[PDB]
PDB file of C-alpha atoms in Angstrom:
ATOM      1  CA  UNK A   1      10.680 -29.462  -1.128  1.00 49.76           C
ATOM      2  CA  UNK A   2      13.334 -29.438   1.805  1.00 48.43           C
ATOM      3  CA  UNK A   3      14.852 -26.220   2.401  1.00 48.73           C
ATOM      4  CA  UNK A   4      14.579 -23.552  -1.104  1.00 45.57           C
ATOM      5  CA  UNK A   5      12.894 -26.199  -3.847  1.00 41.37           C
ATOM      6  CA  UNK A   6      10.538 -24.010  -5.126  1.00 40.47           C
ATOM      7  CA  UNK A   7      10.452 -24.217  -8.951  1.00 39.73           C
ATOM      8  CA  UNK A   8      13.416 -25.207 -10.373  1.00 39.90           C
ATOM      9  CA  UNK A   9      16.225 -23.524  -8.276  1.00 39.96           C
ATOM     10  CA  UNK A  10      17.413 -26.370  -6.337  1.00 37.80           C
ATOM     11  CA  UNK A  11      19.782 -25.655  -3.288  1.00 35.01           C
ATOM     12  CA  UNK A  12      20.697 -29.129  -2.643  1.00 35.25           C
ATOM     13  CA  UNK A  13      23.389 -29.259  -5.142  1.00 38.43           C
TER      14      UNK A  13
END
């Protein structure tokens, strides 16, 4: 989505 949002492994967190 931005950087890593793939699935459902945000990276944002």
């Amino acid at each position: 989505v931005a950087r890593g949002w793939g699935r459902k492994c945000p990276l944002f967190g």
